[PDB]
Amino acid sequence: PPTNAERLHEFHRAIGAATPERPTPPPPELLRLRQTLLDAESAEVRAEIDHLLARQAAGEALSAGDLAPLAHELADLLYVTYGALDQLGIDADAVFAEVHRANLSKASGLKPEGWRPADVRGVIERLQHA
Amino acid sequence: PPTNAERLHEFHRAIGAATPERPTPPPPELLRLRQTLLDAESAEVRAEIDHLLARQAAGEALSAGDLAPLAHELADLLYVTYGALDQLGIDADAVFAEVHRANLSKASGPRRADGKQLKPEGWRPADVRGVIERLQHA
Ligand SMILES: O=c1ccn([C@H]2C[C@H](O)[C@@H](COP(=O)(O)O)O2)c(=O)[nH]1
Ligand SMILES: [Mg+2]
Numbered sequence: 692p693p694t695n696a697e698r699l700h701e702f703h704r705a706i707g708a709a710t711p712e713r714p715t716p717p718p719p720e721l722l723r724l725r726q727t728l729l730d731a732e733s734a735e736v737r738a739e740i741d742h743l744l745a746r747q748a749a750g751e752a753l754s755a756g757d758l759a760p761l762a763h764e765l766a767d768l769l770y771v772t773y774g775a776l777d778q779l780g781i782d783a784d785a786v787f788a789e790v791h792r793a794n795l796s797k798a799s800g801l802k803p804e805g806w807r808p809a810d811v812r813g814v815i816e817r818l819q820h821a
Numbered sequence: 822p823p824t825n826a827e828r829l830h831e832f833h834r835a836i837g838a839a840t841p842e843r844p845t846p847p848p849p850e851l852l853r854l855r856q857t858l859l860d861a862e863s864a865e866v867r868a869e870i871d872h873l874l875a876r877q878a879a880g881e882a883l884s885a886g887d888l889a890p891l892a893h894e895l896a897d898l899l900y901v902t903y904g905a906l907d908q909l910g911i912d913a914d915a916v917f918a919e920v921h922r923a924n925l926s927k928a929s930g931p932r933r934a935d936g937k938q939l940k941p942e943g944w945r946p947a948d949v950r951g952v953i954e955r956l957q958h959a
């Protein structure tokens with residue numbers, strides 16, 4: 692099965708948006724777009740969390756189905772976060788894997804003995820060599 | 822390999838945090854916490870993008886290596902966004918798959934001046950309510 696990062700590549704190929712094979716410095720127009728899309732989805736997430744909190748404050752017993760709007764906006768936020776990494780030519784699964792390695796290993800600690808923080812610059816260097 | 826959503830399940834299991842198997846209405850304290858985590862990482866991404874744009878406005882030609890902080894913050898944002906879905910007991914991949922299908926269906930639509938893909942006539946949204954009902958029973 693394809694990963695959510697590979698899904699963004701398929702979407703950008705389908706709509707003709709830049710999706711370079713390896714890490715590539717962006718034009719400012721790209722960064723501005725990614726900023727706009729991230730701001731929009733984080734505001735929608737916030738709006739749906741606020742709605743759930745207001746309904747709970749009024750004593751509403753939320754059902755699982757009540758979480759669908761928030762789940763949709765969280766997925767949209769995932770989508771535009773993956774989408775930023777994809778348009779930068781950066782394999783999001785490789786960067787996530789390194790952030791997860793650090794976070795998960797830190798949870799074996801405070802930090803454990805041979806603890807090594809995330810080295811995303813090292814991931815970007817390896818991605819440049821395909 | 823495990824998916825990134827399954828990685829958050831593994832992380833929450835390693836720190837003893839709440840991780841229901843199926844969609845579970847959360848306590849208000851949980852919602853406020855996840856909102857706080859989202860805002861912290863969103864602000865870091867936003868600041869880093871503005872930082873790169875200011876360097877470009879100064880005439881700097883950025884390199885790929887200059888992108889590593891931004892890639893780090895975007896991955897941090899993924900981590901807390903997957904984390905929110907996992908603490909709600911919601912399979913992020915099942916929801917993402919439905920969202921993704923309805924985004925592929927936009928391909929024939931027009932484009933905004935800034936590059937945003939817009940929806941063609943007759944487009945229909947993802948049915949996330951149906952994903953949630955799927956996850957809740959099974
Ligand atoms: O250029 C685009 C336009 C839309 N989306 C995705 C992000 C969300 O999943 C959803 C938001 O689209 P709107 O509902 O705001 O039109 O589509 C992108 O990734 N890139
Ligand atoms: Mg949205």
Ligand SMILES: [Mg+2]
Nearest residue numbers: 862865894897
């Ligand atoms: Mg961060």
